[PDB]
Design a protein around this ligand. Structure first.
Ligand code: 0C7
Length: 263
């Protein structure tokens, strides 16, 4: 069983509330990875604990090119340690900060990786992955890996959406404190797709009340430059009624997806 001293530690890749993710490499094989460090006196108060340690078993069994792999974990006394696959390009979020908005080539391609990721997840009885741009990492050359998992680490940047970025990705069901089911995740794709193409989420607003309002009532529009197979796609992803949202495969089929993916 691994322990901290099997690792060299590099810079923090991100700092969240429960702890940091550090660039690390195992001492022998000199293999590079990411070491996620969770304080755990932090985890008490949030009421999150050994129920998460039953949970890490899940992400441990998930294997897929578009999902960040959790190689292993250990703890000591004061800290929990997740040994994760390292993603060299970082977050689609910084990238969107750089490019301001993406083009259709990448979007449909990112959208396809995502839909593949979640289809896999679903089949494992795993739903409601956090799909926000800051939780999405870029692997070796181009690939998209859902980082999800360990609760929201940031790499230094921004200060506009710090919070007020949260709400933008939640469908009505889930904010309305109704139940949530496996269709949640299809609403997210629609929010991503719009943000990839637009460089802002469909529902962005100055206040939480207003955002909430726009989500609840599905009030969002398109700048003119958005192509109309792209409208069709988004429009069909964001449906107040979950049941009117497609299964994941339709997404993959959708004639705009199939058209524009560099893959
Ligand atoms: Cl999910 C996440 C978001 C922000 C920061 C760190 C993480 N966690 C992980 C997990 C596995 N790999 C990585 N890779 C990574 C690589 C580079 C950077 C970065 N961008 N700009 N400066 N450093 C961030 C994360 N992050």
């Amino acid at each position: 069983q691994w322990a901290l001293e099997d690792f060299e530690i590099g810079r923090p890749l991100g700092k969240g509330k429960f702890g940091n993710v550090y660039l690390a490499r195992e001492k022998q094989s000199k293999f590079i990875l990411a070491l996620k460090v969770l304080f755990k006196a932090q985890l008490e108060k949030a009421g999150v604990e050994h129920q998460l340690r039953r949970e890490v078993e899940i992400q441990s069994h998930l294997r897929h090119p578009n999902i960040l792999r959790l190689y292993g974990y250990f703890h000591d006394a004061t800290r929990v340690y997740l040994i994760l696959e390292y993603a060299p390009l970082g977050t689609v979020y910084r990238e969107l900060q750089k490019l301001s908005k993406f083009d259709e080539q990448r979007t449909a391609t990112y959208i396809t990786e995502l839909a593949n990721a979640l289809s896999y997840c679903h089949s494992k009885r795993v739903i409601h992955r956090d799909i926000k741009p800051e939780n999405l990492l870029l692997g070796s050359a181009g690939e998209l890996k859902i980082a999800d998992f360990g609760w929201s680490v940031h790499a230094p940047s921004s200060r506009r959406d710090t919070l007020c970025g949260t709400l933008d990705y939640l469908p009505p069901e889930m904010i309305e404190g109704r139940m949530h089911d496996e269709k949640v995740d299809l609403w997210s794709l629609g929010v991503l797709c719009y943000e990839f193409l637009v460089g802002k989420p469909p529902f962005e607003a100055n206040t939480y009340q207003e955002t909430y309002k726009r989500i609840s009532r599905v009030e969002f529009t398109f700048p003119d430059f958005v192509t109309e197979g792209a409208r069709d796609l988004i429009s069909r992803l964001l449906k107040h009624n979950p049941s009117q949202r497609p299964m994941l495969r339709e997404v993959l089929e959708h004639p705009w997806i199939t058209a524009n993916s560099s893959k």
